[PDB]
């Protein structure tokens, strides 16, 4: 080691594994110094560190001691060299002819357990083929082990080709036509679809095979223009490409949908500009879906060509082309999701704002989003968006906005508004929408329990024509909106707090506690850290206190009362007086660090003759950790660890 | 139905009357298929059954084959046409209720019948407006055993996806609803979970087949993780292991998991880990290990949750034994009252004044398991913890991944909480060694827990593998050192080997704090000579260790992150006394005093 | 067999004698039940000794004792008597027993809760069998005990963690935690109450 | 065929408005003709898990009406009812508890496991189903086992 002849150290260690002459602690110290040297520098020592670690591991195995942490660390990334060297050391150090059954069993078990620890299967087999492994293990147990490691990652072969009783038995023309229709239904490749339809129009006469499946559906806006094609084969081919591509897009089979739509676009370019533009719209919608389902939900930006195509579709104003409003919805959602606020708020033509309500809504959302640091125009845009939404969420003066869908006053229907937001995934936009709907939900009455939100201040505090607003529809809408947003990001603590607040206003306190604890768990890595005060404010803590009181978990109320900036003794003392507690009571006294609460508990149990619980409380007071005149850091740490333990107990209890 | 036995003898008569020309026979066949399609209302399943049995006089069987083919084609046209009112097919309306039996029949894998029954299942699923496709898929998944039978379900999905949508979420929801109710008994439950795991793994086995199918089994199963985690706790071990195999490979939802979902998954996972480690030993732990590794990788919250729950379960009263942890009365009394002597005055009094306590104490016999199985249970647990703690990830083939000091810090803080929750003196800075006389009860508790649970030392060296993390275990190290110092002060033997555990604990302690770079190499090697020393000498050496830690302190700010290897480094030379020369003087004097036995060990304590 | 043996004859003879002694002096019956005896003999003595209807008189006094064992014995004895003599006085004493159980559910600590409720929870099945009017009170008490014990389970780490099971079927039949054991006992007694009332 | 378009609307209903209106229509014609609810059973089964109070309550009422008319098909509702009791959505659990005694008397062979599940979710949850369990148990006992 002084001379750096590390290979000789490895050879001495391998030889010593047979004799056990060297001290174990000496070998461990040598390995530790080698690891220290490797960490300081000299990356060539990584080989040496592994080699001596493997030697020490083999020695410890033969001596019947635990495998080191460094061995498992080095076997996180197994290689050919590591495993073959380990097997070489094992074979050199075993000495089977001399070795006892004890050492043989130890080495056998060690190889068995190293085999279990290999994710890769080639390494398992190459250890299995080793002579030492075969000699030490019985063929039965070796076979069993390789069976287990093979079924760990079992390659499975499955038939993807659908069943087909496709045989000319008999060879009648009707049977041929029917099985061709079956093939057409099953087929998805446009070329084979064209072949099948060519053959079908071959042996038939004006059959109009677009009718072959009732499940082939096309939007009615396109049915008239498609069925107007003159040639029966071309009309049928266009209809089948339409239906199959739309269905594939529905079931997220986007590559096949792309093939079908590309074939249809190629076909209609010959003789139809209207169908060509329809095909262009369908390819644009399909491309949006591909991006949002593929490279989307990961943060990578879309290519500029798709953005330009979206803008081109938005700004085109051809009147003859039959247009589906869903494509415009998806385009506005695409722009909003990818933070194209500048285009929406500046570059949109005015006729699109006047005609399409979704584009107007997108412009409003983008404007109120980008203007948030600047309160001047943000306020104006907030009022505009508020007006638009309250018009959408109001009825014309019995009428219910949900039952009478058409009864709205806004630019479009409330259901349309909901379905548009369900296309939006951008966190800030959803935060804005949720803040607006929470503000709207709060002002129905002078309710004490008002739900909060991130941007509740920018909305106006007044409404013209209050009575027109159907607040039942507002409550339904905000519930769906909260559920959708949590389905987008379940770990958004603000939305979790909004959900908890909703559940609290509805007087279902178990769910409210569930979502409040979830919000706290998000911000603190399951309470391993302190929950931030901005999350667990005094108001949130008071709402959890009321949730616990209403569930008759009164000791939990007493514990939670300590979480406030100023500990609320009034509520704690009132709740501890209760005798219908539905929690563990005295099992929760370990989470009390305030000596005043424990003094009250002792007095209360003495007053009631509950001497056992009184002695538990007195023991709780008598902890030197809880002494009120201790240094403030010790008391803070005691409070913090009790906080963490109590909150994790509540987490386990409520979820 | 009444005409099922007559044909068995009347088939010859039927063929005899079937001498009509080919055109008339074909017209009769068309009329027959139309009639059976448009009329069969109640016993149509029995009709289909005996028809298939007669299809499998060879001419009768061939006629049955052609009729079945024509009927399949006619039903195909009947279901798929005109698109708009729906069309009524009484045959299929009769067959909907027999969907389970039909699924069972095609699952027997005959040479030619199963194809017809499968095609009929596809047609029936398309025909039914509340489509029985999800139900049929669920039946096939819950009943199939071999991949050949699972191919029936894949083929059915392939045939139905061209027309229907949403089959797999509905199938999984129905199957799981049946599972969580009393229905779908554990055989079929385990079959369903195994088949679903097979499909998910097949999908992740990214060949051309999954791409062609476009089923998204993993995506669909990812929606039902809350319905799958409780199955890990299922009493039937087949269900639990099938659930573990499915969850190990099932992708998590696209964005993330809610904290409730994450915690439920982690808790079920660690319970499954310990239960299957107890039951099957290390080989039955791979699925739970993989699931917990993925959960650790999901987010830092998931990492902290899985680490703390894993070690807390390991140190729990249950599962300690896995890791070498510790742990006619009046009639007879009347018999014993038979007076040996007549008594002082003919009246007998009992000899004793009473009984102390509740009589004799029970012996409290101890039990110890195999040491080899303890070693390899510890190996499985420690490999899982290393996988959870390791950074992602030829990249220096002879080297190893770096263990995350944040994961190791999580392990350290939960270790401290488990062992010494009452951390009043929890400063990382070490106090004067006189303070050890104030916290004697705490230190003895720590020492007793280290004695009872040998796993604690393994976890301590795991923590010490990541350098800055062992700083946070300072309270446990201090308490164990104080306990050992008290033991060596109170020791009356002249040799240290008479206290084998305390010698082993002192050696392991000095080795861990050297490996954690809380001690320099010189003071990190004294454990090699502990076994050759008297108790007061080893006590003096450990007091030198305490003095060094007073001077320098196990403070994580002393650790400098080295971006070259991505590891924290404690360089004692910059500390100004890193060699511990005042604390090395005691060690050198101890060597010199026992030079007769510690001469050859002088090389281990050289200055450079 | 448990019925056709010399042991059954001896039990009948002893029951006859004890019937005679209790008739001669009911204070002896009171003293014997304040001393208590193994609960395995409770159905035997209640069925075989007609004098035990007088035990309903001093059961309210026995319940008031500070010893936990005496209260446990009083509860079990009352359950067996209620199975035997279903009378309005029996119903009133059963109501008193359920009220006492609910009262000391909030007086006993965790260890005392385990010790008191493990033997006395099967007795609640008998009160349900004898008195359907007690269904509301007994189910409410069972819900309270189950919620308390679930909280206690959540307090500490557990080897089983019945909170996350949450959906088990009828788990028909070790050194486990007291809290998970008590949770399982609550589940089992609720199952027995339901099965009796549905079969 | 007469209620086939209604059922197609019911299956394809994504918004609360479409589902609510088709459910109200089906409610009307089932009050007129209870026998038709057999054609809707799967769809309304799926709708009892819906996270919308009006839709869920309407689906529950229609399912209970259908089972009242034809008690043989009550067992077909057991997995969805138990799923509703076992759902993570708390409002779904409360709705299922609200309708618990009626379904208990409609099933009566799986009422044991149904009430056991109700007690379990009331126990490890923080709700108090003692009233519903007690009423169901009382009426079922006095109807079935004395």
The DSSP-derived string for B262-306 is HHHHHHHHHHHHHHHHHHH-GGGGHHHHHHHHHHHHH-HHHHHHH
Report chain B's terminal Cα–Cα distance, integer Å: 100
Q: Are D1 and B89 in contact (CB under 8 A)?
A: no
Q: Is C138 an interface residue toward A (CB < 8 Å)?
A: no
Rg from Cα positions in chain A:
36
Interatomic CA distance for residues B241 and B258, integer angstroms:
24
Q: Three-state SS string across B207-236, please?
A: CHHHHHHCCCHHHHHHHHCCCCHHHHHCCC
Bridge partners of B562, per DSSP, are B567
What's the gap in Å between the CA of D84 and the closest CA on chain B? 9
C145 phi, psi to nearest 5 deg: -65, -45
Instruction: Specify the DSSP class assigned to residue B561.
Output: E
DSSP string, A319-346: SSS---HHHHHHHHHHHHHTT-HHIIII
Q: Which of B63, A590, B313, A432 is nearest to C110 (CA)?
A: A590
Interatomic CA distance for residues D116 and D86, integer angstroms:
12
Interatomic CA distance for residues C45 and C17, integer angstroms:
11
Going by C-beta distance under 8 Å and a sequence separation of 6 or more, which residues neighbour residue A22?
A: A12, A13, A16
Q: String of b and e for A149-173 (b: at least 16 CB within 10 Å)?
A: beebeeeeebbbebbebeeeeeeee
Interatomic CA distance for residues B65 and A165, integer angstroms:
11
Find the residue in B nearest to C38 (Cα).
B328
Does the CA dihedral B82-B85-B91-B95 come out positive or negative? Answer: positive
Contact B181 D82 (CB under 8 A): yes
Q: Which H helix or E strand runs over B568?
A: strand B567-569
Going by C-beta distance under 8 Å and a sequence separation of 6 or more, which residues neighbour residue B207?
A: none
Find the residue in A nearest to B374 (Cα).
A66
Going by C-beta distance under 8 Å and a sequence separation of 6 or more, which residues neighbour residue B195?
A: B141, B142, B144, B150, B153
Q: Are B156 and A158 in contact (CB under 8 A)?
A: no
B63 phi, psi to nearest 5 deg: -65, -40
Instruction: Specify the DSSP class assigned to residue A458.
Output: S
Instruction: Specify the DSSP class assigned to residue B151.
Output: H
Identify the residue among D101, D110, D121, D130 best suited for mutation to test binding to C, counting C beta carbons within 10 A and taking the highest: D130
* DSSP 3-state of B562: strand
Interatomic CA distance for residues D39 and D66, integer angstroms:
10
Interatomic CA distance for residues C81 and C101, integer angstroms:
18
Number of other residues whose CB lies within 10 A of the CB of residue A53 = 23
Number of other residues whose CB lies within 10 A of the CB of residue A374 = 9
How far lies B134's CA from each of B164, B168, B195, D43, D77, in Å?
Answer: 10, 7, 15, 13, 16
Q: Are B377 and B552 in contact (CB under 8 A)?
A: no
Burial of C108 (0-12, 13-18, 19+ CB in 10 A): buried
Task: Report the half-sphere exposure of C183 (CA within 13 A, side-chain side).
Answer: 27
Interatomic CA distance for residues A255 and B521, integer angstroms:
62
How far lies C46's CA from each of B462, C50, C59, C127, in Å?
Answer: 63, 7, 14, 15
Interatomic CA distance for residues A355 and A607, integer angstroms:
75
Quick one: tokens of C72?
């446990």
Number of other residues whose CB lies within 10 A of the CB of residue A286 = 20
Quick one: tokens of B179?
């599972």
Q: Is D82 an interface residue toward B (CB < 8 Å)?
A: yes
How far lies A228's CA from each of A148, A197, A223, A235, A237, in Å?
Answer: 63, 18, 8, 8, 13
Q: Which of B26, B112, B114, B128 is nearest to B75 (CA)?
A: B128
C57 phi, psi to nearest 5 deg: -75, -45
Contact C112 A612 (CB under 8 A): yes
% helix, strand, coil for chain D, step of 5: 80, 0, 20
The H helix count followed by the E strand count for chain D is 9, 0
Does the CA dihedral B112-B113-B114-B118 come out positive or negative? Answer: positive
Q: Is A510 an interface residue toward B (CB < 8 Å)?
A: no
Number of other residues whose CB lies within 10 A of the CB of residue A193 = 20
Task: Output the CA angle A41-A46-A51, nearest 5 degrees.
Answer: 145
Contact A511 D16 (CB under 8 A): no
Going by C-beta distance under 8 Å and a sequence separation of 6 or more, which residues neighbour residue B33?
A: B67, B70, B71, B74
What's the gap in Å between the CA of A586 and the closest CA on chain C? 6
Interatomic CA distance for residues A474 and A153, integer angstroms:
51
Interatomic CA distance for residues A263 and A240, integer angstroms:
11
Rg from Cα positions in chain C:
18
Q: Which H helix or E strand runs over B200?
A: helix B186-204
Interface of B with C (CB under 8 A): 180, 182, 229-230, 233, 235, 264, 267-268, 271, 274, 309, 312-313, 316-319
Which residue has 């949770």 as its token pair? Answer: C183
Which residue has 């660090």 as its token pair? Answer: A593
Interatomic CA distance for residues A88 and A62, integer angstroms:
15
Q: String of b and e for A544-573 (b: at least 16 CB within 10 Å)?
A: bbbbbbbbbbbbbbbbbbbbbeeebeebbb
Peptide bond into B113 cis (omega under 30): no
Q: Are A651 and A496 in contact (CB under 8 A)?
A: no
| Residue among C150, C194, C195 whose CB faces D124 most closely | C150
Interatomic CA distance for residues B479 and B415, integer angstroms:
13
Q: Are A242 and A226 in contact (CB under 8 A)?
A: yes
Contact A165 B69 (CB under 8 A): yes
Interatomic CA distance for residues A509 and B198, integer angstroms:
41
Q: Which H helix or E strand runs over B147?
A: helix B147-161
Task: Output the CA angle B257-B262-B267, nearest 5 degrees.
Answer: 160
Quick one: tokens of B46?
């029995």
DSSP string, B60-111: HHHHHHHHHHHHHHHHHHHHS---------HHHHHHGGGHHHHHHHHTT--S
Quick one: tokens of B456?
């604690």
How far lies B339's CA from each of B329, B331, B342, B359, C135, in Å?
Answer: 18, 15, 6, 22, 55
Instruction: Specify the DSSP class assigned to residue A68.
Output: P
Q: Are A502 and A451 in contact (CB under 8 A)?
A: yes
Q: Are D73 and D34 in contact (CB under 8 A)?
A: no
Residues 472-491 of A with CB under 8 A from D: 476, 479-480, 483
DSSP string, B491-546: ---SSSTTSHHHHHHHHHHHHHHHHTTSS-TTTTSGGGSGGGS-HHHHHHHHHHHH
Interatomic CA distance for residues D29 and A611, integer angstroms:
66
**Helical H runs in B349-420?**
371-389, 405-419
Quick one: tokens of B552?
């320098």
Quick one: tokens of B513?
């704090």
How far lies C50's CA from each of B293, C34, C45, C56, C91, in Å?
Answer: 67, 19, 9, 13, 19
* DSSP 3-state of B567: strand
Q: Are C163 and C133 in contact (CB under 8 A)?
A: no
Q: At how many degrees (to 10) do helices B44-55 and B113-127 cross?
A: 150
Q: Are C136 and C193 in contact (CB under 8 A)?
A: no
What's the gap in Å between the CA of D82 and the closest CA on chain B? 6
β B560-562/B567-569 pair status: antiparallel
* DSSP 3-state of A387: helix
Q: Is A514 an interface residue toward B (CB < 8 Å)?
A: yes
Task: Output the CA angle B252-D88-A292, nearest 5 degrees.
Answer: 40
Number of other residues whose CB lies within 10 A of the CB of residue A518 = 26
Bridge partners of A469, per DSSP, are A394
Q: Are D47 and D23 in contact (CB under 8 A)?
A: yes
Quick one: tokens of C145?
């005990």
Burial of B265 (0-12, 13-18, 19+ CB in 10 A): buried
| Residue among B233, B312, B318 whose CB faces C165 most closely | B233
Task: Report the half-sphere exposure of A358 (CA within 13 A, side-chain side).
Answer: 24
Interatomic CA distance for residues B425 and B72, integer angstroms:
82
Interatomic CA distance for residues C195 and A489, integer angstroms:
44
Bridge partners of A394, per DSSP, are A469
Q: Which of D25, B385, B522, B25 is nearest to A67 (CA)?
A: B385
Q: Which H helix or E strand runs over B455?
A: helix B455-465
Resolution (A): 3.1
* DSSP 3-state of B560: strand
Interatomic CA distance for residues A462 and A464, integer angstroms:
7
Interatomic CA distance for residues D48 and D56, integer angstroms:
5
Rg from Cα positions in chain D:
15
Interatomic CA distance for residues B275 and B300, integer angstroms:
25
Contact A649 C155 (CB under 8 A): yes
What's the gap in Å between the CA of C91 and the closest CA on chain D? 17
Quick one: tokens of D41?
């059973």
Task: Output the CA angle A574-A577-A580, nearest 5 degrees.
Answer: 115
Name every chain D residue with its beta carbon within 8 A of the beta carbon of C136: 130-131, 134, 138
Interatomic CA distance for residues A613 and C107, integer angstroms:
7
Name every chain B residue with its beta carbon within 8 A of the beta carbon of D1: 85-86, 88
* DSSP 3-state of B569: strand
Contact D127 A510 (CB under 8 A): yes
How far lies B310's CA from each of A200, B235, B296, C157, D33, in Å?
Answer: 65, 21, 11, 11, 59
Interatomic CA distance for residues B460 and B466, integer angstroms:
10
Q: Are B192 and B175 in contact (CB under 8 A)?
A: yes
Q: Which H helix or E strand runs over B546?
A: helix B535-551
Q: Which of A571, A585, A579 is nearest to A543 (CA)?
A: A571
- C-alpha B106, offset from chain centre: 36
Quick one: tokens of A622?
């008598």
Contact B318 C159 (CB under 8 A): yes
Interatomic CA distance for residues A588 and A156, integer angstroms:
52
What's the gap in Å between the CA of D65 and the closest CA on chain A? 22
Q: Are A49 and A85 in contact (CB under 8 A)?
A: no
| Residue among A418, A514, A582 whose CB faces D15 most closely | A418
* DSSP 3-state of A214: coil
Number of other residues whose CB lies within 10 A of the CB of residue A592 = 25
Q: Which of B285, B352, B355 is nearest to B319 (CA)?
A: B285
Q: Which of A201, A191, A269, A195 is nearest to A231 (CA)?
A: A201
Quick one: tokens of A630?
């201790």
Interatomic CA distance for residues B65 and B404, integer angstroms:
68
Quick one: tokens of C68?
């936990």
Q: Are B143 and B104 in contact (CB under 8 A)?
A: yes
Interatomic CA distance for residues A47 and A6, integer angstroms:
10
Interatomic CA distance for residues A517 and C113, integer angstroms:
28
Interatomic CA distance for residues A375 and A246, integer angstroms:
45
Name every chain C residue with its beta carbon within 8 A of the beta carbon of B235: 168, 171
Count of positions (residues) in chain A: 655
Q: Three-state SS string across A271-309, please?
A: CCHHHHHHHHHHHHHHHHHHHHHCCCCCCCCCCHHHHHH
Q: Are A129 and B123 in contact (CB under 8 A)?
A: no
Q: Is C26 an interface residue toward D (CB < 8 Å)?
A: no
Find the residue in A nearest to D54 (Cα).
A476
Find the residue in C nearest to D137 (Cα).
C197
Count of positions (residues) in chain C: 199
Q: Is D119 an interface residue toward A (CB < 8 Å)?
A: no
Interatomic CA distance for residues D19 and D53, integer angstroms:
12
Task: Output the CA angle B577-B579-B583, nearest 5 degrees.
Answer: 85
């Amino acid at each position: 080691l002084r001379s750096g002849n590390y290979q000789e150290v490895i050879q001495i260690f391998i030889e010593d594994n047979l004799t056990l002459s060297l001290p174990v602690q000496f070998r461990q110290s040598v390995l530790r110094e080698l690891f220290k040297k490797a960490q300081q520098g000299n990356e060539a020592l990584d080989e040496i560190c592994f080699k001596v670690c493997a030697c020490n591991t083999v020695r410890d195995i033969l001596e019947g001691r635990t495998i080191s942490v460094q061995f498992n660390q080095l076997f996180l990334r197994p290689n050919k060299e590591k495993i073959d060297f380990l097997l070489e050391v094992c074979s050199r150090s075993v000495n089977l002819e001399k070795a006892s059954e004890s050492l043989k069993g130890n080495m056998a078990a060690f190889l068995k357990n190293v085999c279990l620890g290999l994710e890769d299967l080639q390494y398992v087999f190459m250890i299995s083929s080793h002579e030492l492994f075969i000699t030490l293990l019985k063929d039965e147990e070796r076979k069993l082990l390789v069976d287990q490691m093979r079924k760990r990652s079992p390659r499975v072969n499955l038939c993807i080709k659908p069943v087909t009783s496709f045989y000319d038995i008999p060879a009648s023309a009707s049977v041929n036509i029917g099985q061709l229709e079956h093939q057409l239904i099953l087929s998805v490749d446009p070329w084979r679809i064209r072949q099948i339809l060519i053959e079908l129009h071959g042996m038939t006469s004006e059959r109009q095979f677009w009718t072959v499946s009732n499940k082939w559906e096309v939007p009615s806006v396109y049915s008239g223009v498609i069925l107007g094609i003159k040639d029966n084969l071309t009309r049928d081919l266009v209809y089948i490409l339409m239906a199959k591509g739309l269905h594939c897009s529905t079931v997220k089979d986007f590559s096949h949908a792309k093939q079908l739509f590309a074939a249809c676009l190629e076909l209609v370019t010959e003789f139809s500009p209207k169908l060509r533009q329809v095909m262009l719209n369908e390819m644009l919608l399909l491309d949006i879906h591909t991006h949002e389902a593929g490279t989307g939900q990961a943060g990578e930006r879309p290519p500029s060509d798709l953005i330009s195509r979206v803008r081109g579709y938005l700004e085109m104003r051809l009147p003859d082309i039959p247009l589906r409003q869903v494509i415009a919805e998806e385009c506005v959602a695409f722009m909003l999701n990818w933070r194209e606020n500048e285009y929406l708020t500046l570059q949109v033509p005015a006729f699109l704002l006047q005609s399409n309500p979704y584009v107007k809504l997108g412009q409003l959302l983008a404007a109120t989003c980008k203007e948030l640091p600047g309160p001047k125009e943000s306020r104006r845009t907030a009022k505009d968006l508020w007006e638009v939404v309250v018009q959408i969420c109001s009825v014309s003066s019995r009428v219910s906005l949900i039952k009478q869908r058409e009864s709205t006053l806004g630019i479009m229907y409330r259901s349309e508004l909901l379905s548009f937001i369900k296309k939006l995934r951008e966190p800030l936009v959803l935060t804005i929408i949720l803040s607006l709907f929470v503000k709207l939900h709060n002002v129905r009455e002078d309710i004490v329990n008002d739900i909060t939100a991130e941007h509740i201040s920018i909305w106006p505090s007044s409404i013209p024509n209050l009575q027109s607003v159907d607040f039942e529809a507002v409550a339904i809408t905000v519930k769906e909106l909260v559920r959708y947003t949590l389905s987008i990001n379940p770990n958004n603590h603000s939305w979790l707090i909004i959900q908890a607040d909703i559940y609290f206003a509805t007087n279902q306190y178990s769910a409210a506690l569930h979502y409040y604890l979830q919000a706290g768990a998000v911000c603190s890595d399951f309470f391993n850290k302190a929950v931030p005060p901005d999350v667990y404010t005094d108001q949130v803590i008071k709402r959890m206190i009321k949730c616990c009181s209403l569930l008759n978990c009164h000791t939990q109320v007493a514990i939670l009362c300590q979480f406030l900036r100023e500990i609320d003794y009034k509520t704690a003392f009132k709740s501890l007086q209760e005798q219908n507690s539905h929690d563990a009571m005295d099992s929760y006294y370990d989470y009390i660090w305030d000596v005043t609460i424990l003094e009250y508990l002792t007095y209360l149990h003495h007053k009631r003759g509950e001497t056992d619980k009184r002695q538990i409380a007195i023991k709780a007071i008598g902890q030197t950790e809880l002494n009120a005149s201790n240094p403030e850091e010790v008391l803070q740490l005691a409070a913090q660890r009790r906080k963490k333990k109590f909150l994790q107990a509540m987490a386990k209890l409520y979820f | 139905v009444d005409c099922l036995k007559p044909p068995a003898v009347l088939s010859q008569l039927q063929q005899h009357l079937q001498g009509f020309p080919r055109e008339e026979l074909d017209n009769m066949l068309n009329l027959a298929v139309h009639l059976v399609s448009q009329a069969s209302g109640a016993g149509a399943y029995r009709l289909l059954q005996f028809l298939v049995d007669t299809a499998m006089p060879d001419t009768v069987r061939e006629a049955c084959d052609r009729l079945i083919q024509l009927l399949l084609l006619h039903l195909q046209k009947l279901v798929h046409h005109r698109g708009p009112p729906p069309r009524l097919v009484p045959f299929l309306d009769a067959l909907k209720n027999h969907v389970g039996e039909l699924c069972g029949e095609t699952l027997r894998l005959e040479r030619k019948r199963f194809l017809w029954q499968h095609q009929l299942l596809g047609l029936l699923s398309v025909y039914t407006r509340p489509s029985c496709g999800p139900e049929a898929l669920g039946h096939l998944l819950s009943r199939a055993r071999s991949p050949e039978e699972l191919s029936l379900a894949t083929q059915l999905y392939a045939g139905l996806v061209v027309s229907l949508s949403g089959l797999l979420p509905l199938a999984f929801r129905s199957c799981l609803a049946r599972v969580h109710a009393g229905t779908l008994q554990p055989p079929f439950t385990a079959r369903f979970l195994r088949n679903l795991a097979l499909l998910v793994g097949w999908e992740q086995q990214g060949g051309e087949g999954p791409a062609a199918l476009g089923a998204h089994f993993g995506e669909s199963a990812s929606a039902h993780l809350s319905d799958l985690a409780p199955l890990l706790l299922h009493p039937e071990e087949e269900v639990a292991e099938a659930a573990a195999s499915l969850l190990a490979i099932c992708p998590f939802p696209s964005e993330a998991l809610s904290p409730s979902q994450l915690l439920g998954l982690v808790r079920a996972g660690v319970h499954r880990f310990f239960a299957s480690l107890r039951l099957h030993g290390p080989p039955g732990v791979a699925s739970a290990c993989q699931l917990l590794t993925r959960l650790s990788q999901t987010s830092p919250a998931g990492l902290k949750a899985v680490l703390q729950l894993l070690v807390e379960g390991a140190l729990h009263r249950g599962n300690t034994e896995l890791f070498g942890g510790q742990v006619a009365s009046l009639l007879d009394t009347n018999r014993r009252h038979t007076a040996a002597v007549p008594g002082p005055g003919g009246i007998w009094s009992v000899f004793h004044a009473g009984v102390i306590g509740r009589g004799l104490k029970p012996p409290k016999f101890v039990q110890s398991r195999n040491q080899q199985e303890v070693i390899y249970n510890t190996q499985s647990l420690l490999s899982l913890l290393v996988h959870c703690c390791s950074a992602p990830g030829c990249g220096e083939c002879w080297g190893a991944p770096i263990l995350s000091p944040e994961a190791a810090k999580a392990v350290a803080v939960t270790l401290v909480e488990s062992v010494c929750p009452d951390a009043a003196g929890a400063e990382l800075a070490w106090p004067p060694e006189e303070h050890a006389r104030a916290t004697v009860e705490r230190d003895l508790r720590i020492g007793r827990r280290f004695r009872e649970q040998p796993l604690l030392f393994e976890l301590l060296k795991l923590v010490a593998a990541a350098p800055p993390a062992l700083c946070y275990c300072s309270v446990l190290l201090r308490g164990l050192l104080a306990a050992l110092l008290g033991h060596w002060e109170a020791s009356r033997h002249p040799d240290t080997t008479h206290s084998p555990w305390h010698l082993e604990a002192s050696c392991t302690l000095v080795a861990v704090m050297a490996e954690g770079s809380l001690l320099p190499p010189a003071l990190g090697n004294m454990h090699e000579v502990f076994s050759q020393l008297a108790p007061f000498e080893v006590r003096l050496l450990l007091l030198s260790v305490w003095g060094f830690l007073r001077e320098h302190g196990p403070l994580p700010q002393k650790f400098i992150f080295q971006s070259e290897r991505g590891r924290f480094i404690r360089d004692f030379s910059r500390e100004g006394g890193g060699e511990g020369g005042p604390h090395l003087a005691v060690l050198h004097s101890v060597l010199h005093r026992n030079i007769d036995r510690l001469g050859l060990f002088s090389g281990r304590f050289q200055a450079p | 067999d448990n019925l056709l043996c010399n042991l059954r004859e001896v039990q009948c003879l002893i029951c006859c004698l004890l019937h005679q002694m209790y008739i001669a002096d009911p204070n002896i019956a009171k003293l014997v039940h304040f001393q208590g005896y193994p609960c395995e003999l409770l159905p035997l003595t209640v069925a075989g000794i007609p004098s035990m209807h007088i035990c309903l008189d001093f059961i309210p006094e026995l319940i008031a004792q500070p010893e936990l064992e005496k209260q446990i014995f009083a509860i079990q004895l009352l359950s067996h008597l209620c199975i035997q003599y279903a009378l309005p006085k029996s119903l009133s004493v059963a109501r008193l027993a359920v009220n006492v159980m609910g009262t000391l559910l909030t007086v006993l600590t965790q260890a005392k809760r385990y010790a008191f409720f493990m033997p006395t929870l099967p007795s609640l099945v008998s009160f349900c069998r004898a008195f359907p009017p007690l269904y509301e009170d007994i189910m409410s008490l069972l819900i309270q005990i189950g919620q308390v014990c679930a909280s206690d389970v959540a307090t500490q780490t557990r080897d089983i963690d019945p909170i996350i099971t949450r959906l088990q079927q009828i788990k028909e039949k070790g050194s486990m935690d007291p809290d998970v054991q008590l949770c399982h006992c609550i589940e089992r007694t609720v199952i027995e109450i339901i099965n009796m009332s549905v079969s | 065929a007469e209620m086939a378009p209604y059922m197609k609307r019911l299956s394809r209903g994504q918004t609360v408005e479409d589902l609510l209106e088709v459910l109200s229509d089906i409610d009307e014609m089932s009050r007129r003709r209870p026998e038709i609810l057999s054609f809707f059973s799967t769809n309304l089964q799926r709708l009892m898990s819906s996270a919308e109070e009006c839709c869920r309550n309407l689906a529950f009422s229609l399912a209970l009406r259908s089972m009242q008319n034809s008690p043989s098909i009550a067992a077909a509702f057991l997995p969805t009812f138990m799923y509703c009791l076992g759902s993570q959505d708390f409002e779904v659990v409360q709705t299922a508890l609200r309708n618990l005694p009626e379904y208990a008397l409609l099933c009566q062979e799986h009422a044991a496991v149904l009430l056991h599940r109700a007690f379990l979710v009331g126990m490890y949850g923080q709700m108090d189903p003692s009233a519903q369990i007690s009423e169901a148990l009382r009426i079922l006992h006095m109807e079935a086992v004395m």
